[PDB]
A paper describes a structure:
[name] is a multi-domain kinetochore protein specific to kinetoplastids, such as [name]. It lacks significant sequence similarity to known kinetochore proteins in other eukaryotes. We recently reported the X-ray structure of the [name] C-terminal region, showing that it has a tandem [name] (BRCA1 C Terminus) domain fold.
Our recent X-ray structure of the C-terminal region of [name] shows that it has a tandem [name] (BRCA1 C Terminus) domain fold with a sulfate ion bound in a typical binding site for a phosphorylated serine or threonine. Our initial analysis suggested that the [name] domain in [name] is involved in phosphopeptide binding. We show that the [name] domain can bind phosphate ions in solution using residues involved in sulfate ion binding in the X-ray structure. We have confirmed that in solution the [name] domain binds phosphate ion in the sulfate ion binding site previously identified by X-ray crystallography. Mutating the residues involved in phosphate ion binding in [name] [name] [name] results in growth defects confirming the importance of the [name] phosphopeptide-binding activity in vivo.
Author numbering: 474 to 520, 525 to 616, 628 to 645
């Protein structure tokens, strides 16, 4: 978060549809209350992503299925601090200056992926992430771990 302490850069005025992933109950409620308190066209949506999703709140790097789906569908991935800092500033801050992540255009789109791992929940989840991003799983990018898929996704264009 490298905002200016004098004139912190404002985010665009536009609806923000927040979801959270893998937060504690406590910090999810604090994020909810802060979104509700600032308002300014933002709402917290309840739980794969709700179709109205623009922003995913998560602590740390993308790890959950919801977070990876956000990575590959050009959602903003922001830390809880994005919400609290914006409430402190009095308006929604610029997502990029706050350190938020967004990968546009959708990486994986029209890309083909060979998942060199055995069958199981992890392979199934990665297939769903690939498809959610508009990619196809080969029944040209070889992936042996979710980590490798994430590094591909954040390093395009």
């Amino acid at each position: 978060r490298s905002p200016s302490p004098v004139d912190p850069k404002r985010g665009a005025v536009q609806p923000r549809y927040f979801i959270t992933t893998s937060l504690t109950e406590k910090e999810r409620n604090s994020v909810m209350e802060a979104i509700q308190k600032l308002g300014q066209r933002a709402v917290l949506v309840d739980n794969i992503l709700p179709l109205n999703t623009t922003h995913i709140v998560l602590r740390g790097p993308p790890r959950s299925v919801a977070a990876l789906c956000g990575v590959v569908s050009s959602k903003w991935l922001v830390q809880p601090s994005y919400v609290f800092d914006s409430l402190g500033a009095g308006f929604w801050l610029d997502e990029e200056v706050e350190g938020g992540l967004r990968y546009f255009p959708p990486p994986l789109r029209c890309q083909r992926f060979l998942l060199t791992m055995p069958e199981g929940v992890v392979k199934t989840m990665l297939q769903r992430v690939v498809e959610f991003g508009g990619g196809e799983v080969v029944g040209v990018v070889v992936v042996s771990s979710g980590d490798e898929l994430l590094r591909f996704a954040i390093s395009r264009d």
